[PDB]
Amino acid sequence: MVGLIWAQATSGVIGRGGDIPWRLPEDQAHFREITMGHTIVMGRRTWDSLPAKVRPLPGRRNVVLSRQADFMASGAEVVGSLEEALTSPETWVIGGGQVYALALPYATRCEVTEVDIGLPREAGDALAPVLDETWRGETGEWRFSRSGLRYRLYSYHRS
Ligand SMILES: NC(=O)C1=CN([C@@H]2O[C@H](COP(=O)(O)OP(=O)(O)OC[C@H]3O[C@@H](n4cnc5c(N)ncnc54)[C@H](OP(=O)(O)O)[C@@H]3O)[C@@H](O)[C@H]2O)C=CC1
Ligand SMILES: Nc1nc2ncc(CNc3ccc(C(=O)N[C@@H](CCC(=O)O)C(=O)O)c(O)c3)nc2c(=O)[nH]1
Incomplete structure (x- = not known):
């Protein structure tokens, strides 16, 4: 998974x-x-x-994708390909824009938080992958954060 x-x-x-x-x-x-x-x-x-x-x-095994063969990250496993990164039965991909896009086809669950903030896209931003109709989702209720922003949780899955 x-x-x-x-x-x-x-x-x-x-x-x-x-x-x-x-x-x-x-x-x-x-x-x-x-x-x-x-x-x-x-x-x-x-x-x-x-x-x-x-x-x-x-409390998590940290795996980091880099094309720098020499790159070392203290406390993390640096790997050069997604293949080398996805060897654990349950793996959570935690970004960013490039790696979400790379891993999307491998994924059968998404846990998504929507943040109700006015933030139009700007050139060079990192963007979330778009979930198409292969995904089934449950939409949680809106909550206010202590920060003042409303947010809600989605759980998506596809078999
Ligand atoms: N809101 C959220 O939930 C999250 C937000 N973020 C945000 O996302 C942004 C970063 O996302 P982004 O800029 O897309 O960068 P990523 O975090 O996706 O890292 C991209 C890097 O990963 C490596 N990489 C990419 N593709 C491959 C590949 N095919 N094989 C091997 N290594 C590869 C390269 O590392 P190298 O250059 O060393 O070769 C590349 O520079 C930040 O602003 C961060 O704060 C991140 C996670 C979650
Ligand atoms: N939904 C959701 N997904 C994410 N996926 C990836 C990143 C990348 N960036 C992160 C991820 C985790 C932390 C972080 O401090 N996490 C700590 C503290 C947790 C706590 O504060 O209780 C921990 O997990 O132990 C961070 O400072 C930046 N962010 C999010 C994110 O904000 N939201």
Whole structure:
């Protein structure tokens, strides 16, 4: 089972300027709950974007995709291909835009947070993959974050 997990603005934006363009602590706790105890796979940029305090993310086997054969990330397994990254039975792909797109065909679950923030797409943003009609989804109820932003959770699956 390969799953993808991400949070997006309604527009599809997931990243800008090498970071995530909003604050939503409740969603980050959700991320931890889903991923804890599993292998997680991410692109090198997403690894770079993790706060030092949680790089690597604790309690998870951190796998990082890079085309730099020499790249080393403390506490992570650097691999050069998606094939080498997807060897664990349950794997969560945690981004970013490039790696979500790469892994989408391999995935049978998506755990998606929609963030109700006005954030029109800009050139060079990182974007969420678009889920087509092969996916079946359940839509959760809107909640307000302590940050003031409304958000909701989707669970998608395809067999
Ligand atoms: N809101 C959310 O849920 C999330 C948001 N983000 C945001 O996403 C953005 C980063 O996404 P993005 O810029 O797309 O970069 P990624 O995180 O997807 O990392 C891309 C890097 O992965 C490596 N890579 C890509 N394709 C391959 C391949 N086929 N084989 C081997 N290595 C490969 C390269 O590393 P190298 O260059 O070292 O070769 C490439 O530069 C940031 O802004 C981050 O904050 C990230 C995760 C979740
Ligand atoms: N839905 C959803 N998916 C994501 N998938 C990938 C990334 C990449 N960026 C991340 C991922 C995790 C953290 C992080 O600090 N996580 C900690 C703290 C958890 C907590 O605060 O309770 C942990 O998991 O232990 C981060 O600072 C950036 N983000 C999200 C995201 O924000 N939302």
